[PDB]
Amino acid sequence: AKEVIVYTSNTCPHCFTVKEFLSENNVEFTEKNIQTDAAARKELMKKGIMAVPVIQIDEEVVVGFDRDKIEELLG
Numbered sequence: 001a002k003e004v005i006v007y008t009s010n011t012c013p014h015c016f017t018v019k020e021f022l023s024e025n026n027v028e029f030t031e032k033n034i035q036t037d038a039a040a041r042k043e044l045m046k047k048g049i050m051a052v053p054v055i056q057i058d059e060e061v062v063v064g065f066d067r068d069k070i071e072e073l074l075g
Contacts, residue, residue: 002074007033007049025074049061
């Protein structure tokens with residue numbers, strides 16, 4: 001099972017889709033809210049990303065909800 005991180009915020013209109021897709025497929029994930037967690041925002045910007053929502057499959061970064069890419073990375 002690959003580590004799944006979801007970078008979210010308090011003003012993210014597309015986070016619900018990603019969270020729902022992951023939860024309905026019973027794929028647990030770590031949520032990091034970059035608006036309330038300065039550490040999370042630092043980690044996200046260190047990898048050169050400033051967007052929301054973001055999905056990290058254990059090293060690989062998906063900006064936005066790329067359904068088939070996520071499905072392929074997770075199996």
